[PDB]
Amino acid sequence: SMTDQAFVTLTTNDAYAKGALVLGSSLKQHRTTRRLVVLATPQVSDSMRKVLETVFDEVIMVDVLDSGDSAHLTLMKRPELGVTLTKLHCWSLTQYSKCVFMDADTLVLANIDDLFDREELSAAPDPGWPDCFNSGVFVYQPSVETYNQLLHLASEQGSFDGGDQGILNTFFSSWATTDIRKHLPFIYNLSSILPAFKVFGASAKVVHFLGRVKPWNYTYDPKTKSVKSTHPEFLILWWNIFTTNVLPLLQ
Amino acid sequence: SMTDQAFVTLTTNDAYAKGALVLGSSLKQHRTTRRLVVLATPQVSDSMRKVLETVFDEVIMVDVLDSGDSAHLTLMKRPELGVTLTKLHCWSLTQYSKCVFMDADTLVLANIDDLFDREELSAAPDPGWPDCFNSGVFVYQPSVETYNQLLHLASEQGSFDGGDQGILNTFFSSWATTDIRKHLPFIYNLSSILPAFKVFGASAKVVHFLGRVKPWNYTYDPKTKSVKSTHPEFLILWWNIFTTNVLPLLQ
Ligand SMILES: O=c1ccn([C@@H]2O[C@H](COP(=O)(O)OP(=O)(O)O)[C@@H](O)[C@H]2O)c(=O)[nH]1
Ligand SMILES: O=c1ccn([C@@H]2O[C@H](COP(=O)(O)OP(=O)(O)O)[C@@H](O)[C@H]2O)c(=O)[nH]1
Ligand SMILES: [Mn+2]
Ligand SMILES: [Mn+2]
Numbered sequence: 001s002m003t004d005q006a007f008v009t010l011t012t013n014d015a016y017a018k019g020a021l022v023l024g025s026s027l028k029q030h031r032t033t034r035r036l037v038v039l040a041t042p043q044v045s046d047s048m049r050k051v052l053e054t055v056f057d058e059v060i061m062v063d064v065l066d067s068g069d070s071a072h073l074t075l076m077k078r079p080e081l082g083v084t085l086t087k088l089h090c091w092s093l094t095q096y097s098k099c100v101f102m103d104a105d106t107l108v109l110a111n112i113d114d115l116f117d118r119e120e121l122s123a124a125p126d127p128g129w130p131d132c133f134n135s136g137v138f139v140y141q142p143s144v145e146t147y148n149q150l151l152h153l154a155s156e157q158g159s160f161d162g163g164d165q166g167i168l169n170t171f172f173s174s175w176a177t178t179d180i181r182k183h184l185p186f187i188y189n190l191s192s193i194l195p196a197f198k199v200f201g202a203s204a205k206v207v208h209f210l211g212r213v214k215p216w217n218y219t220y221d222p223k224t225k226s227v228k229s230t231h232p233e234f235l236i237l238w239w240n241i242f243t244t245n246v247l248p249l250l251q
Numbered sequence: 252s253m254t255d256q257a258f259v260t261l262t263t264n265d266a267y268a269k270g271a272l273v274l275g276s277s278l279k280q281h282r283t284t285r286r287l288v289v290l291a292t293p294q295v296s297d298s299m300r301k302v303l304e305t306v307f308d309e310v311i312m313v314d315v316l317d318s319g320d321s322a323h324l325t326l327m328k329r330p331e332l333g334v335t336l337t338k339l340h341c342w343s344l345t346q347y348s349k350c351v352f353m354d355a356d357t358l359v360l361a362n363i364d365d366l367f368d369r370e371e372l373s374a375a376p377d378p379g380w381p382d383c384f385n386s387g388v389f390v391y392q393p394s395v396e397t398y399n400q401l402l403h404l405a406s407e408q409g410s411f412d413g414g415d416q417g418i419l420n421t422f423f424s425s426w427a428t429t430d431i432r433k434h435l436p437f438i439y440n441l442s443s444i445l446p447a448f449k450v451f452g453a454s455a456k457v458v459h460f461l462g463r464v465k466p467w468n469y470t471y472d473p474k475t476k477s478v479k480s481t482h483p484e485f486l487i488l489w490w491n492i493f494t495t496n497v498l499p500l501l502q
Contacts, residue, residue, distance in 0.1 A: 124381075125376060125381035125382070126381075127378050127379050127380075127381060128378050128379075128444075128447070129378075129437065129447035129448070129451070130375075130376035130377075130378060130381035130437055131376070131436060131437040131438075131451075132447055160446055160447070160449070160450045161446040161447070162446075166446070166450070176434070176436065176437075177431060177434075177436070178431065179431060180428060180429065180430060180431040180434075183427070183428075183431075185382060185427065185428070186380065186381055186382040186427075187382075193379075195411055195412040195413075195417070196379070196380035196383055196411070196412070197380070198411070199411045199417070200380070200382075
């Protein structure tokens with residue numbers, strides 16, 4: 001293995017846990033040589049953690065509601081940010097020298113181990129405001145200091161969008177205008193939100209299921225091998241990995 | 252003046268001509284020291300050209316249907332690209348050493364003369380596929396050679412999107428991964444297509460009315476000083492410039 005480097009994701013409940021299982025399975029399918037880590041909350045059932053342990057190398061419990069937790073004081077100032085402050089613990093994983101964070105609503109389509117050639121903070125442009133990076137996929141260097149700086153910003157300013165992206169863009173404010181290599185190609189975080197896709201979509205490495213309805217919210221029908229009601233192949237691939245690679249794992 | 256440098260736009264009919272008048276007026280309002288040039292087709296009425304001559308320094312006729320025109324042979328190979336091939340004549344303006352091209356559906360909100368500090372090809376990211384630049388605002392160096400290269404590409408490949416953006420991104424294919432200074436801030440070409448706008452929208456320099464319905468397609472009502480049926484201030488500002496600055500110009 002590479003014990004030094006990891007893909008890291010986050011699950012705060014059993015639903016998003018299904019995303020992480022598909023994500024993690026997709027990274028394994030494409031033969032990552034890196035470690036797979038999921039940050040989990042106590043809202044994730046013990047039974048679902050057990051399933052998570054079959055795909056991830058580490059299942060690391062984070063509970064911001066605990067007074068022992070580093071973020072707990074910040075949560076009391078900003079109680080609307082529990083999920084965000086949990087995600088930012090990704091910077092506390094100081095046993096790793098470099099990590100790629102990935103949202104549980106991502107799916108990997110090709111080997112993306114070359115991301116570890118990048119430096120903090122490397123991320124793809126967000127559609128809709130492309131001078132902000134999308135926080136669903138980013139390369140970072142674990143650090144207690146950086147983590148504590150991020151907590152402080154969250155304390156002072158909250159997030160301009162109620163999630164982690166605002167706060168990450170505010171702290172990492174030089175991304176839009178400094179060093180192009182920190183701009184991940186859009187194909188490493190391709191929002192499922194048209195003629196450009198016909199030309200470039202085939203080279204997609206990561207698809208990101210941005211928005212309200214997540215792939216596990218759909219009703220899957222084995223009879224038709226698809227869901228009840230743009231490029232629907234990605235949603236179908238999600239459920240292929242789920243039914244094929246994930247389902248037989250704890251038995 | 253600066254006789255060396257110009258803002259350049261394009262009008263193929265009387266409708267888009269109204270956009271160019273508002274654009275040009277907005278550049279004058281914000282006190283550009285550069286020259287204002289509009290490329291016009293014979294589909295633009297002589298009476299509307301006369302109004303255009305009150306705002307622009309040069310009204311340059313381009314007719315791709317003419318056998319004397321440089322693009323005419325390319326048009327016969329690709330007859331669906333008349334508008335595109337007309338726009339690309341912007342590169343034929345070799346009397347200027349550097350130009351900013353702007354679509355007739357842009358409106359300037361602040362002085363953007365600092366764009367002339369940039370080099371070919373400097374453009375803002377397109378929302379939706381942000382590793383392509385949006386072709387509504389770009390800094391370029393006039394050149395017969397570049398122009399002829401662009402014609403050839405148009406001949407060989409057409410455009411992957413039926414307009415000029417595909418062809419410009421294909422020719423200028425290194426934009427996404429080389430030299431960040433060629434990435435215009437999104438505020439220099441802000442698509443009217445939300446929490447990021449609350450934080451960053453106020454610093455907008457150029458708004459771009461992307462999409463089907465253009466500002467002059469709206470019915471303006473002087474009684475209410477707004478239109479019949481997101482951030483509606485931009486559309487209202489368009490019509491303010493039209494009614495205030497443009498309307499009294501030929502009398
Ligand atoms: O209720 C939640 C909210 C978010 N997350 C995690 O935080 C990330 C960011 O949220 P989300 O992906 O739902 O936002 P979006 O990507 O749609 O903008 C998710 O991918 C998860 O890893 C989670 O586990 N549970
Ligand atoms: O019928 C047309 C089509 C386009 N154009 C010019 O070409 C540009 C690009 O087209 P458009 O702005 O309509 O495309 P969009 O910006 O909406 O994607 C316009 O701004 C105009 O300057 C024009 O004059 N007449
Ligand atoms: Mn996400
Ligand atoms: Mn336009």
